[PDB]
Symmetry: C4
Subunit: 470 residues, 4 copies
């Protein structure tokens, strides 16, 4: 139970802007002494979970996030064949070495430039008959003709190492190298992958989230319509480690029926359901058979949902109430409030959530499946909720005649596309993960907690007026 | 009675920004299962009522809103002959087929272009000896000389159908048509009207608001000065289905006298009176003989009325108090707070109002009586409270000498003209009605209410601080 | 005592933005039935008092405000000879006819143009041997050479009338006149003054504030330093009807001594003292012998005083407390909070103040003593707290050596000059008085009060959160 | 204990924007009757203390602030030799005459121009064989060739006086001088220093803060890592009058150990420790042996610390609680909230703090160690937290291998450089000190306190809503 300062008993619900953490006595000497592992059974070693948004949940996203201890949920409308392919690709990745962008010496320079932005490494490795022959950077290919080929651009001077060497040794090798990328190769000499100098440190900081067979974890979502049981069984057979039953309004008859149908199969996977913002809804979802309840409905005071309907709840009070209700029954809750700062993750963990769902914030990253765009000032940006609308209408395309599609489409708003600018200092999602984990670790050291359960047990909170925001 | 979360007992009055709806358990599968019909005796099938503003309350407005289940109140100062003409025109319209813009082949192309914007259809039908001969669109007439005529512009290729055919068939016919407008014709072959492809769906979604004789409903307002009884009797004889006695300050001796005078005639129509913001005023207006009390005085914290006088009340608390007071006596209340988002309509219905009055928001539509204007960036806009001031001074023109007109005009502010921009995606008022009804239906599904009485009975509300708006 | 809605008991002090008036039952048919006369013994017929600011308190200001029922306080540092001259000039004015700008036919056209802006009439009357010979307008003199004279510009076609004729007749005469100014002349035929067509109505609306001898009233301020008794006696002998002892911090030993010294003389005039924001200070000032207590210290949350020192109080709570304390002893209070909207005057009167002090708001008027300036966009503006600083340092100039002047001047901020733009529709102060009185009368009709005592006795107030300002 | 108005019991923590001071009865005739001396044993005569920030804590800063009664804390990472040199330089300065910028006649004019901005005097004195030969101003050197020398620019007409003359006489001598700088010289005729005409008044207003030997006071900071005892002993031997043990999070085991280690040496100096925001932390720090507790953690609602971690406390409530806790044990507290207006200093003193720490606000001054920069509009500005980052990484440079430096540097944000513009009217820090002391003295006169203890004993405070900030 979250403790509050004496006399702090507001007559209203609290947002993240209404509360602050009071520093306690702390024995935690450094941020590295803090263990961020979660206990909700999701197997993540960091509290960050990536939302099942088409503009965010890519295969590159899944690999990169799972390697650092997070987990990514695949969108519900992805075809089962694509789901199986993505799961196999993710579970075939290495736990330490990142999968690089690779190029044959015959591809156009323009295609190489376009593919260069698909990863945070900033350099591609040219491959010939399965062997690496040179590196190519942005500045190298940028100064050549539009119709030039890769062959006469790559430079053969690059650092290389066998797989399995100590990442500290890779860091030492790259100290004076002109390029921050070392190529790791199998003992057969075939291309195995690349390590960035920062990646060697990250491999020591972050523990990968792996299943019982030592492969990277991944999750998949299901809709509340159709044969939910068959879809859940198919996804479980495809190798998904966790299932999310997602709808805009949990705590309705269809969700209870879907949760019962999925639980009857006894797949043995953790089952996530949401969203709800009340203790009664959390109790109903847990009794129906869900193990984890996803929390959050119309969180913002000026969000689309609340401006359309007036329905919602401030995130902090909802998370507190739902976490208390779930812990009463031995369940766990996920915060799905639309995190935008590390403060939100820290406060959600303090309120009692076991994990935090991050959505459009990760859209503005290289590893997101969307293509890179440039503004008038050539600043890189990506469109959140852009082409993904097609997938939504795909769920309508399988439905009835165009008459019913237009009838259902009458009471629907236009696409809420958003310009997510990429941070030049934090273009890669690993930088955002570093930012968030740094904030959480600092919060734990301020409270004096060695782990998240201690953070929830020992935190003290106070309430501030709006006048401090003037 | 509206229920509030435990401990939510503020020491102040609440606006729409101070409250939110908490989702309950819901059996409502879809938004189409929700019945939006009102019980206040006004006969509307949607809670939307259009305010008696000269810049909004047109005959096109009345027809279009009444066809979709709303109702429009005519301004108080309209002459009785114009009132009778408008009532006859509205009650001669068809319940399904919309009245199109029509042109003879001899009118100038410029006049056709000017008239094209008077409806949301975007195309006019050329008529000769009562028969349709072709369609004309914006792009067709835009590419021709300023002095060209309609004759040599119209194209004879258009879809046509007899009146009374299934709107689904009209939708099917228009699927591959180059123009989204089908011409419906009487069996005699004379022009009967047009259906837009969206109109065919809307005719299945919305039930028209009709009187006992099956004609579209309309209402008219009366002032509190002069012979109120004679004016009310004249308007009732003209065929108005509902009477609104309107003044800026209800709960005064003149309003009580006027309500008594109108009720003494026993016209049998519902009688609306306002505005008041207190339970005592609602009780007085109901006891005087009013059936419906219109609520709202200086709603906004920075409105003209409150900046001039400091008089007003936040809309939510006023609506709650007045609705409780009226339901104690078996009356009903209308919310006249100046709706700007569907959230306001939903919250007004939750507070206990039976209907909602919408004013200047509908000014920026094609069907509004004002003429279209274009900004420097050629964006379409209309002037709210523009030429309508003349009508106001018309009430002064019938009065005393210019000396008294200037004396009374000394303590009066200038005209509060406003630039209401037209939404390119929602240029027609039917799009705004779709927006509002979508918001209300979503609110009902979130609460789990099949109808508005259930919405008022089952809603749960919470209070938020201002800090969430930072 | 101000009544509040049930449960409205805030744990903080209230500003004007925190409160609203709730409309009561009202028998007041029209705004003209409301009597705005004050009972504090100041003799004003409207609650407006003009602050003793050098940039505002001019002789034109005093005449124009006193004619409409207000009163103006002369600055404390004005020399006694100038005070006597201004008092004689004000008390020699006519109660109905305004003193016009007059020109001899030999003055330069440029000087005529410069003097034209000194009054709201917009036209000057050329005088020769004490007789009027023609009118001159802005547009007439604007189209002529920079060195032209008045003689060959004036037009002899103007409306004229004897003094004492009914203002309604003057209104009738001016109805079709090309110029809105009628020249009133004594029976000897000498120039007596002018009436603007609006002035004829204002003369029927507003009752002038006159002393026992039927001359216009005026007040003068004294400082708390030096021989306060001698200065007060000199000002009383000069004919000032009311004395204001003013300092930035009332409720200090020097103020008590000064009030005792002035009261010992038994001049028989009302005595104003301030400022204080506490009941204890009001009691002390009244017991010392003051009849009226001026209320307000650092009213704004971001004013200079509060940003410098953190000292102040919200205006509404201070006025309520001080008015209650003063009425306990039979005194009265003046609100000196820096009015900027008519809402502030209405709320100050509702809280219990008998009069309201208006300062820099009136600076942006023609009748203010400052000269007209024009921005880059040629918009007219005036500098509040501009040259007046000299007068302040004049109080330092009479003091000690330049060493002490610099020593005292070390702990002083720079001049807080402000750009007060003139409203094109309200360039004259009479328009601002009309605005304020219209707001107050509307408030009285909403409450249902025929006079200010009834307004204080019957008003009901509520409290709103800050969320309504989002 | 701070007293609050009746009924003011908020359910939240208060910032400086939430509270105001209510004027009491006051016998303090003038601001000069107020004694600003502190009782915390730091020996300052004004409550201003300068933070140990590299961008602020310079030797010029230390001299100028100590001469006016303040004190400056040297950064923790400054080498001990530089600390000793700075302490000797500060303790060799004169108590009245300021150390001028001096130039030999052979230096380039460009170097003279660059050095001219290092002091607020605005003029340099050319020295030859230890004797003054002329003055040089900005305008003089600005109109000459880029390669010109000082020799042929200096003007020999300057005012001179022997050291020890009455500052009033120096003021009199400078009254009609063309240059506001008088050169004070030893009886041997060698250059001793300069007095600005304002400095002569300031020398009478401000009493210098001096140790038992009559030399200017200075303080030095220590880190919580390494051998804290050895560093403290070295700094005490170097002549530092006060020691500050500083870390971002006080109330942790390492701080308790460091305080115990420093107190065991029994150096006899006052010991400052922070930061904490709770009474428990203050009690722990005092019991460990600290004499003064520095208060403030994440003060702003949108500061970097709170946006990263959600950890902090509003400054007012924290200062009140910590001051009460410390006075219970006979300690004192310093407010380290990031002062930006004199209101903050006054409110911190009212809450119960004995001194106030001022940081980046003083960065935008001539005496700050940073170099002057000019914006596009040639406005002078300085970079707060610019090159100082190097010093931080210097603490990392002495550490482990580059691997550990990068590992620790992963969880660190970029430099928070800020553009601190220099006020043209307040370019020198003495002007800012005058501003702050004027605000504090005005607060004391409003409360009616002759000294800071009376200010804390007699102040009355009220609480305001956020609505006043609209």
């Amino acid at each position: 139970m979250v403790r509050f300062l004496d006399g702090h008993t507001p007559a209203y619900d609290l947002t993240y802007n209404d509360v602050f953490v009071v520093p306690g006595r702390s024995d935690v000497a450094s941020r590295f002494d803090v263990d961020l592992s979660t206990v909700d059974g999701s197997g993540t070693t960091i509290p960050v979970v990536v939302a099942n948004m088409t503009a965010v949940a890519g295969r590159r996203m899944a690999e990169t996030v799972a390697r650092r201890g997070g987990i990514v949920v695949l969108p519900q409308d992805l075809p089962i064949t694509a789901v199986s392919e993505t799961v196999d690709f993710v579970k075939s990745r290495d736990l330490v070495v990142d999968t690089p962008v690779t190029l044959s010496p015959e591809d156009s320079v323009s295609d190489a430039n376009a593919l260069l932005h698909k990863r945070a490494h900033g350099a591609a490795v040219v491959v010939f008959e399965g062997r690496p022959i040179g590196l190519v950077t942005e500045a190298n290919c940028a100064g050549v003709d539009r119709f030039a080929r890769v062959r006469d651009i790559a430079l053969s001077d690059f650092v290389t190492a066998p797989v399995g060497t100590d990442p500290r040794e890779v860091f030492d090798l790259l100290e004076h190298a002109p390029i921050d990328v070392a190529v790791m190769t199998a003992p057969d000499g075939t291309l195995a992958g690349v390590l960035t100098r920062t990646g060697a440190i990250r491999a020591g900081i972050y523990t990968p989230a792996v299943d019982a067979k030592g492969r990277l974890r991944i999750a998949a979502a299901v809709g509340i319509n159709g044969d939910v049981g068959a879809k859940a069984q198919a996804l479980a057979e495809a190798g998904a480690d966790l299932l999310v039953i997602d709808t805009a309004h949990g705590h309705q008859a269809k969700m209870l029926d879907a949760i019962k149908a999925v639980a009857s199969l006894d797949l043995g996977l953790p089952l996530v359901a949401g969203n709800v913002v009340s203790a009664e809804g959390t109790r109903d979802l847990i009794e129906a058979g869900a193990s984890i309840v996803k929390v959050g409905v119309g969180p913002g005071a000026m969000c689309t949902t609340r401006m359309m309907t007036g329905v919602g709840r401030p995130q902090f009070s909802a998370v507190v109430e739902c976490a208390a209700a779930a812990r009463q029954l031995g369940g766990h809750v996920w915060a799905d409030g639309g995190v935008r700062h590390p403060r939100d993750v820290a406060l959600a963990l303090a309120a009692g959530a076991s994990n935090v769902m991050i959505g459009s914030w990760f859209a503005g990253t290289y590893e997101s499946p969307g293509d890179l765009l440039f503004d008038r000032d050539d600043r890189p940006y990506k469109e959140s909720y852009g082409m993904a609308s097609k997938r939504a209408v795909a769920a309508r395309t399988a439905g009835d005649s165009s008459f019913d599609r237009a009838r259902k489409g009458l009471f629907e708003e236009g696409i809420s596309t958003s310009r997510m600018s990429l941070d030049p200092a934090r273009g890669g999602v690993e930088d955002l993960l570093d930012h968030i984990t740094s904030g959480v670790r600092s919060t734990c050291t301020y409270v004096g907690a060695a782990n998240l359960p201690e953070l929830h047990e020992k935190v003290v909170l106070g309430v501030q007026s709006a006048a401090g925001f003037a």
